[PDB]
Amino acid sequence: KRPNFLVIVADDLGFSDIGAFGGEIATPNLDALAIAGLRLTDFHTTSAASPTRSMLLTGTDHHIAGLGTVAEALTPELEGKPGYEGHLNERVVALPELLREAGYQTLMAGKWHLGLKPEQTPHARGFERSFSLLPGAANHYGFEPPYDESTPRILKGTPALYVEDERYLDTLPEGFYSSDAFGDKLLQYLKERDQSRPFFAYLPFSAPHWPLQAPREIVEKYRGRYDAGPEALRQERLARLKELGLVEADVEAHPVLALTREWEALEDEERAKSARAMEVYAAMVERMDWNIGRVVDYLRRQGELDNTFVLFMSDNGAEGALLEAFPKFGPDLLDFLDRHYDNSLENIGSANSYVWYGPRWAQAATAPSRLYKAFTTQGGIRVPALVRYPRLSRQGAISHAFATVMDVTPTLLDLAGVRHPGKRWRGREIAEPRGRSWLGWLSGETEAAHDENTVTGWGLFGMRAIRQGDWKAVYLPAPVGPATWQLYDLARDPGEIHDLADSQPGKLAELIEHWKRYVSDTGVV
């Protein structure tokens, strides 16, 4: 009997935020799935939202699938390059397109980020029912600033732009909050389904992405929890990750890098507003979890949960960006926020606040990894992941087997009994997956879907990484790194701390060869 699929994606969720991944945040629904299922510690996305999402729905690399760089950063020197179209292109077929022709009902509620135009929406790319925020982010409550020439570029590119199927929405309902609206819509779609056939349900939240906003009654639950700051938090998370066996007891955490003032150097007002941002974030995660519970509990009561392959992942590392630090997100973002929002302590988290938590809170969640979102180090690309499907033998454990987002499409086609069509689909040439199906591994037949010779590449925002087995080389340009290849043995040094470039030039050499083939195979510019 063919399984259902429930693929749930958090937006900028960090590695140890969820209870079953070492966190203090209340996530009882996700915990129950994770502990019963398989937690992954070596599962990888890309370093940003739309690249990852392009891969998750294709089984190939973002440079092929249309998100060679993020759309919001395309220049005229890249526009025209194949795979840099700025949206999911027609050089790929998506997973829902393939399941839909094989009898699955394809259902989505959440953030898309794969295209703004009609012919690029979920309805156009294989979803029969969809309720979607098309851009990368937006106000969770739908409160919009004035849009004119003087509006910061980062706000202009994040309107609350929603579609349902083919209808671009004029207005949002009363009481709209993103995670609740997504929960509501996917539950509706599930209740209205044809019960004699399986479904592919896609639940990409916009939480916990900035602006950090959540229901006050949930924020209140975290009052005072983060008063000790982000370095005290990082220590609690590291200890708990070791206690749970998610990281080995000897692991050396990468040092925290930040241009901001450390907690103890902050004035009391500043501290209070930063802790409140973290209390808000925690509420965002809890309320996402609560909506997940609504979906999952419905399926359970229907007797469908055990027949549903449930995959949860974040889409990249925790978000450490200072949005004020990027002039191109302006002109003056902070002044505009100061004149149009209220970020006073007591308003933070509500519709007319606009905050992000910054590098220090972000690195508490990525530890022991190096850095955070938009870096090709482990901090930006190693994300929490779980699989709950009791029809698979490998459940109840923590697995450190290498995996990536590109493995999802081939795994789900496999379970559906559906063959990838090859190099041609709907009269056009298409790419075949670069990932590998997880079926043998999760069946207990092999110990991993990949091996010591597997080669995987990353490149975005000028950064690079190239990995074979557990050897990884990384390239961070100025001002963020030495603008040279650094080499790491991930099996001994997960924090990417000890550069082996000089002591293992032969291994670096080979990885640089692999990197050239990566660029060549996928069209990296």
Residues in touch with Ca ion (CB under 5 A): 11-12, 49, 315-316
Minimum distance between the CB of residue 137 and Ca ion, rounded to whole angstroms? 9
Write out the two tokens for 295. Answer: 């979906």
**Strand, helix or coil for residue 486:** strand
Between 229 and 379, whose beta carbon lies closer to Ca ion? 379
Minimum distance between the CB of residue 381 and Ca ion, rounded to whole angstroms? 12
Place of tokens 């429930």: 6
DSSP string, 409-473: HHHHHHHHT-----SEETTEE-PPPSS--SHHHHTTSSS-SS-TT-EEEEEETTEEEEEETTEEE
Between 52 and 291, whose beta carbon lies closer to Ca ion? 52
Between 49 and 442, whose beta carbon lies closer to Ca ion? 49
Give Cα 223 to chain centroid, integer Å.
Answer: 27
Give Cα 373 to chain centroid, integer Å.
Answer: 9
Between 18 and 511, whose beta carbon lies closer to Ca ion? 18
Minimum distance between the CB of residue 53 and Ca ion, rounded to whole angstroms? 8
Minimum distance between the CB of residue 224 and Ca ion, rounded to whole angstroms? 29
Q: Which DSSP symbol is given to 302?
A: T
Write out the two tokens for 70. Answer: 């993020």
**One-letter identity of residue 367:** A
Minimum distance between the CB of residue 9 and Ca ion, rounded to whole angstroms? 9
**Cis ω before 410 (30° cut-off from 0):** no
How far is residue 441's CA from residue 249's CA, in Å, rounded to a whole number? 26
Closest residue to Ca ion: CB criterion: 49
Minimum distance between the CB of residue 376 and Ca ion, rounded to whole angstroms? 15
DSSP bridge pairs for 200: 5, 106
Minimum distance between the CB of residue 80 and Ca ion, rounded to whole angstroms? 26
Between 43 and 488, whose beta carbon lies closer to Ca ion? 43
DSSP bridge pairs for 309: 5
Between 199 and 312, whose beta carbon lies closer to Ca ion? 312
**Strand, helix or coil for residue 7:** strand
Between 3 and 51, whose beta carbon lies closer to Ca ion? 51
